Amino acid sequence: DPIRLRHLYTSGPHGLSSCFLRIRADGVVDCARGQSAHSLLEIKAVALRTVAIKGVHSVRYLCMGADGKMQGLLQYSEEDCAFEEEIRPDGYNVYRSEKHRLPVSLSSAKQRQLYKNRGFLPLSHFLPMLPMVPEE
Amino acid sequence: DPIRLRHLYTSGPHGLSSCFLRIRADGVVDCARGQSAHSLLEIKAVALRTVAIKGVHSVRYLCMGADGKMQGLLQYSEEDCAFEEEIRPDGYNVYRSEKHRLPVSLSSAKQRQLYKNRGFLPLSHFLPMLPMVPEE
């Protein structure tokens, strides 16, 4: 199916923390305060509900490593960079990794303990936002 | 690409504050009133729009530390001393640090609060000036 250019938005319960998934040139994955060139992602279907996410600007694939820690890799590998896209009741998406048994998330090392301490991960629900300006 | 020898010029709104980024022998980074041997910088491309800045006279690399505070280090480290060079509408350049999420600036500790209080940093727009006398 068609390719999608979007900005993945998430936030904490307070709301004051607006976070757009950003893939940096140095391979780091963090939170951007608003839509930017580093947060513009290319979401491509690889299988049924499975997708690959690539930073348009950094040209790095969103990949999952140890503990579900996210990073941007220049080289794509299905097992670490392909995720099952699922819509949640809140209308946001969760991107799950089969191999790592965890959803993509911008949670910190300390926050990741909540996946088995409460059964969830902070900053793991993402709403694909269309860019505020046409682009392709 | 080729190496560039320049003097980075900036100023305050009053204009009365002419500032050339100076890298001192004692590692301190401050404002020079005019072009001098301490303000002669070597700007070298490391990647696409990424550059390294070294004081010719002090032989110190322009590096960013805590709060974006600038200092001159004898030892180069990409994460703290490499910046993305971007041209602004005023024709001046802003040198951004991916790791520190801030632009190079000669702002004081008190002035740095303006980055999130207004979204900018004083003395962060720099115009690379060619030396007024040939040199290499």
Curated annotation (Swiss-Prot), chains A, B:
Involved in the suppression of bile acid biosynthesis through down-regulation of CYP7A1 expression, following positive regulation of the JNK and ERK1/2 cascades. Stimulates glucose uptake in adipocytes. Activity requires the presence of KLB and FGFR4. The chain holds residues 40 to 175 of 216 of the full protein. Belongs to the heparin-binding growth factors family. The keyword Disulfide bond applies. Keywords: Disulfide bond, Growth factor, Secreted, Signal. Disulfide bonds join C19-C31, C63-C81. This is Fibroblast growth factor 19. Induction: Induced by the bile acids receptor NR1H4 that binds and activates a NR1H4-responsive element within intron 2. It is found in: Secreted. One of its GO terms (molecular function) is growth factor activity. GO terms for biological process: bile acid and bile salt transport; fibroblast growth factor receptor signaling pathway; heart development; negative regulation of bile acid biosynthetic process; negative regulation of gene expression; nervous system development; neural crest cell migration; neurogenesis. Expressed in fetal brain, cartilage, retina, and adult gall bladder. Contrarily to other members of the family that can bind several FGF receptors FGF19 is specific for FGFR4. Interacts with FGFR1, FGFR2, FGFR3 and FGFR4. Affinity between fibroblast growth factors (FGFs) and their receptors is increased by KL, KLB and heparan sulfate glycosaminoglycans that function as coreceptors. Interacts with KL; this interaction is direct. Interacts with KLB; this interaction is direct. Interacts with FGFR4 in the presence of heparin, KL or KLB. Interacts with MALRD1. GO terms for cellular component: cytoplasm; extracellular region; extracellular space.
